[PDB]
Structure 1
Amino acid sequence: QVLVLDGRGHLLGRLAAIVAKQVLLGRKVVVVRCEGINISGNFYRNKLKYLAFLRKRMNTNPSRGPYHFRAPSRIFWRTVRGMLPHKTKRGQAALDRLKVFDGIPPPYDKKKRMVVPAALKVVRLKPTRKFAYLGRLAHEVGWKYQAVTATLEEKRKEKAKIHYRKKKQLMRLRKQAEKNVEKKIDRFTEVLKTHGFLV
C-alpha cells in the first residue's frame, strides 16, 4: 500500500509531478536513491540555476532565511514542497506521507522499487540532449556524503547479487519441476491456457 520509487533515471520535475499528485490523494510514496535523479540541460546550466539559489538569502538575517539544503534527497524534497499547498493544514499532513531518502534504507533494501514511465530520461528526453545528475551536482554545492553513499550502495548492489543468484537457482528448480511432473498436471494446465494463461 506504500509506493517505493527508484530515483535513478527520472527527471526532477516530472517525477515530482507524479509524486505530488499521488501524495494529495492519501497514499504514501517513498522516493529512494535520490542521487539518481537527473536534470535536463548541460551540467554547467543546472549548476548556475542552483548556485544563484544559494545567493537567495535575506541580508539582515540569513539564519531565518531560505534553508539551502545540500543533500539530493532534500533537494527533491524541496521541489515537492513548492508543488504542494504546504501553507495549509492539508499540505502539512501531505508531507508526512512523503518519505524521501538518499541511498537505500535497510527498511527498503528488500522491497521492490517502482518505476514511473512518465518521468524517465530515455522516454521523455531526446537522446541527443544533455542531462545532469543531481548526485554529482549536490556534491559540488556542499553535499559531503557521496563517497559514503557510493561505498554503501556498492555494498547494497553486491548483496542483492547473491539474492538474485539464489532467485535464479530457485527459478531453474521451478522450471525443472514441470519437466518431470507434466505427466500428472496435464489435466490442470490446459484449463489455464484455454483461458489465456501460460502462453
Structure 2
Amino acid sequence: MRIINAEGLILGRLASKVAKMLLEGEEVVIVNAEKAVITGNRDVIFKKYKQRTELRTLTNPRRGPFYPKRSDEIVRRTIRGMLPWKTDRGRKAFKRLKVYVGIPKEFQGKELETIIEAHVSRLSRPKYVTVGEVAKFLGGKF
C-alpha cells in the first residue's frame, strides 16, 4: 500500500494521480485530507459547494445526490469523479481507497509519500482555500 500526505497539495491534481493509481491496481491511503487546498475565490468556492450540497431529488430525498460535506468524503468523491464509476472495474478500483483526516494512531511511524506534481509551490500566488475551511462552511463535523 501507499500512503500520501495531502498537506499542501492541490485537490484536483492529487485526485487525478490517485485515481490513475487505483485503476492501475495499488492500495492508496490519503492521510491528511483536510489540509488539501483549492485555488480560486473563497466566496465562489463556498457557493459552488453549497449548491452541490443543495442538489436533491424533489420526489424522494432518499435518492438524490448525496454530495459530501466532510473533508475526507469531499476528497473521496473528488477521486470518484475521475473513475468509471458505472463499471465493475471502476467500482473495484474505488474500493481500494481509504481517506482519513489527521494521522490516525495506526499510521504513525510510516513513510508518508507526497505528490510532486500537485504541490502548492507551483502556484504563482497562494490564493487558495483549504478543504477543512470548505467543510467548516458547509457544516460538517471536521
Give the shorter-chain TM-score range: over 0.9
Unaligned runs of 5+ in 2: none
- Equivalent-residue separation in structure 1 for 2:106 and 2:64 (angstroms): 34
1:94 maps to 93
**1:131 aligned residue (101, 112, 128):** 128
Unaligned runs of 5+ in 1: 146-199
The structure that has the greater radius of gyration is: 1
- Runs of 4+ in structure 1 deviating by more than 3 angstroms, as ranges, are none
Q: Cα offset for 1:140?
A: 1.4
2:108 maps to 109
1:144 maps to 141
Q: Cα offset for 1:56?
A: 1.2
Q: Percent identity?
A: 39
TM, length-normalised to structure 1? 0.68
2:111 aligns to what SS in structure 1?
coil
- Equivalent-residue separation in structure 2 for 1:113 and 1:107 (angstroms): 13
2:55 maps to 56
- Equivalent-residue separation in structure 1 for 2:43 and 2:22 (angstroms): 32
Q: Cα offset for 1:117?
A: 0.8
Q: Cα offset for 1:68?
A: 2.5
Q: Cα offset for 1:32?
A: 0.9
2:41 maps to 42
TM, length-normalised to structure 2? 0.94
- Equivalent-residue separation in structure 2 for 1:39 and 1:130 (angstroms): 9
Q: Cα offset for 1:144?
A: 2.3
- Equivalent-residue separation in structure 2 for 1:57 and 1:110 (angstroms): 42
2:103 aligns to what SS in structure 1?
coil
Question: Does structure 1 conserve the Cα–Cα contact (< 8 Å) formed by 2:53 and 2:69?
Answer: no
Q: Cα offset for 1:55?
A: 2.1
- Equivalent-residue separation in structure 2 for 1:66 and 1:97 (angstroms): 22
Q: Cα offset for 1:141?
A: 0.4
Q: Cα RMSD between the aligned structures?
A: 1.1
Q: Cα offset for 1:47?
A: 0.4
1:13 maps to 12
